[PDB]
Swiss-Prot record:
Source superkingdom: Archaea
Family membership noted in the UniProt record: Belongs to the tRNA nucleotidyltransferase/poly(A) polymerase family. Archaeal CCA-adding enzyme subfamily.
Residues annotated to bind ATP: 47, 50, 133, 152, 161
Protein's recorded name: CCA-adding enzyme
Residue numbers binding Mg(2+): 59, 61, 110
Protein's job: Catalyzes the addition and repair of the essential 3'-terminal CCA sequence in tRNAs without using a nucleic acid template. Adds these three nucleotides in the order of C, C, and A to the tRNA nucleotide-73, using CTP and ATP as substrates and producing inorganic pyrophosphate. tRNA 3'-terminal CCA addition is required both for tRNA processing and repair. Also involved in tRNA surveillance by mediating tandem CCA addition to generate a CCACCA at the 3' terminus of unstable tRNAs. While stable tRNAs receive only 3'-terminal CCA, unstable tRNAs are marked with CCACCA and rapidly degraded.
One GO MF term: CCA tRNA nucleotidyltransferase activity
EC number(s) given by UniProt: 2.7.7.72
Species annotation: Archaeoglobus fulgidus (strain ATCC 49558 / DSM 4304 / JCM 9628 / NBRC 100126 / VC-16)
Catalysed reaction equations from the record: a tRNA precursor + 2 CTP + ATP = a tRNA with a 3' CCA end + 3 diphosphate; a tRNA with a 3' CCA end + 2 CTP + ATP = a tRNA with a 3' CCACCA end + 3 diphosphate
Record text on subunit structure and interactions: Homodimer.
UniProt keyword annotation of Nucleotide-binding present: yes
Length: 437
RNA sequence: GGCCCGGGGCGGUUCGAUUCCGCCCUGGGCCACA
């Protein structure tokens, strides 16, 4: 029931069992033999190469080394031919540069081409940096592979493990650097409780200082922040999580939380209880990768939230959910309906010129003086948040993300009420409103 | 694709805009993917 106790039991959820290990070992062996039969210059990297991969995420990473002089095009072509002949099944994948994904004796494999170099300088792409990251780590993490797994298991269980945009959490690399710095999971967790948004962890110098942003300097390049994509809020969630764990250690921190569904009926009652306006913007999900899509959902979500605040609808929070089918931007506002009239500030009574221009506008109500300046009663084009957004989304589709915006232009509808509780967003809404139980 | 800094033209709104909402060109930095 104490820290050490829970951690022993926790290993059982993060460390791969022998069957997963053997399975990987057997594929690595066969993979070596196949690569050697073509006399290919390669180097295994990543969590598999260093036995730090989390249970259930066995994936082998093989980077193909290429002379500095080779053209970026030769790399991909020869890179493609090589993965082709060595994999049981292949599938060209992409990123900064293309590569090949596939299978071998049951396990996932990534065949990636990079430049064989020396000295981080002369680098050309993130992929070239990966081997250096690998070298720096193989000597220093040996022996603490399970501390890495506990850290990864902890983060994953709490939805902040990957560094991709859908997550904005802590990359695997980041986790290993943290273990090398603190020595173990518990030490990392114990100290993270004192982390601030100004913390700078410099691995190479074995130092922690106060900078301008959360910054974990890459031992391989002092200018690179390894936690660059860790969001401010995800950082906050981690620090808070560490405080709670240290105060009441539980194995629950390493178990994925149950989706805990809710009957749409109860959701309705809660929204009625809140007296708020709850609605969603629904449109078709553009066929793009999560890495281009989520940042677009975040922007679109924010531009609308911003429209809602300047338009005085008192938005509480925004959210969004993507599906195979559509995307949903979710909102909740304190104001279901606002009056048509509102007041417009005018010039000070002294400014005869501007006062005169200000009184030339034909208005339905007649302006007045108050505290030394003129004011005008004006009429709104819309009186509900839904109306406002239908208006905003129809004309400002372009500012809502390149793709999301293009899809919104060709189609979008606003759903509210019972018709909304039937969409696949009941979970995002419960989180947005802090529904508990 | 998104985010940060900077430039050159515009449209709309406002008594008044560099300064609100947005649109075209456009230079630099960065991030995710591998």
């Amino acid at each position: 029931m104490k820290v050490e106790e829970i951690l022993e039991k926790a290993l059982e959820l993060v460390i791969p069992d022998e069957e997963e290990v053997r399975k990987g070992r057997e594929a690595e062996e066969e993979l070596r033999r196949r690569l050697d039969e073509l006399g290919v210059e390669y180097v295994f990297v990543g969590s598999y190469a260093r036995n730090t991969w989390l249970k259930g995420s066995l994936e082998i990473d093989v980077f193909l080394l290429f002379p500095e002089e080779f053209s970026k095009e030769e790399l991909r072509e020869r890179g493609l031919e090589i993965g082709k002949a060595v994999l049981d099944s292949y599938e060209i994948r992409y990123a900064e540069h293309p590569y090949v994904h596939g299978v071998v004796k049951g396990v996932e494999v990534d065949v990636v081409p990079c430049y064989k170099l020396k000295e981080p300088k002369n680098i050309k792409s993130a992929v070239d940096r990966t081997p250096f990251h690998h070298k720096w780590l193989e000597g220093r993490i040996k022996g603490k592979e399970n501390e890495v797994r506990l850290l990864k298991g902890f983060l994953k269980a709490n939805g902040i493990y990957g560094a991709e945009y859908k997550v904005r959490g802590f990359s695997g690399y980041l986790c290993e650097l943290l273990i090398v710095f603190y020595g173990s999971f518990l030490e990392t967790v114990k100290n993270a409780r004192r982390w601030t948004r100004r913390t700078v962890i410099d691995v190479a110098k074995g130092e922690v200082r106060k900078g301008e942003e959360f910054f974990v300097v890459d031992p391989v390049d002092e200018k690179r922040n390894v936690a660059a994509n860790l969001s401010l809020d995800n950082l906050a969630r981690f620090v808070h999580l560490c405080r709670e764990f240290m105060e009441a250690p539980s194995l629950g921190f390493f178990k994925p939380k149950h989706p805990l569904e809710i009957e749409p009926e109860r959701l309705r009652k809660i929204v009625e209880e809140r007296g708020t306006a709850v609605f969603a913007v629904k449109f078709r999900k553009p066929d793009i990768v999560d890495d281009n899509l989520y940042p677009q959902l975040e922007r679109a979500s924010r531009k609308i939230f911003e429209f809602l605040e300047r338009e005085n609808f008192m938005p509480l929070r925004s959210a969004f959910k993507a599906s195979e089918e559509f995307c949903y931007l979710l909102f909740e506002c304190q104001i279901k309906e606002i009056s048509r009239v509102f007041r417009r500030m005018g010039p000070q009574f002294e400014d005869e010129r501007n006062v005169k221009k200000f009184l030339s506008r034909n208005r339905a109500f007649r302006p007045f003086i108050e505290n030394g300046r003129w004011w005008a009663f004006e009429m709104r084009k819309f009186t509900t948040p839904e109306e406002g957004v239908r208006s905003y989304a129809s004309t400002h589709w372009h500012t809502l993300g390149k793709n999301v915006g293009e899809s919104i232009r060709e189609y979008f509808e606003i759903i509210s009420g019972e018709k909304l509780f039937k969409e696949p967003v009941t979970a995002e809404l419960c989180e947005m409103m802090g529904v508990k139980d």
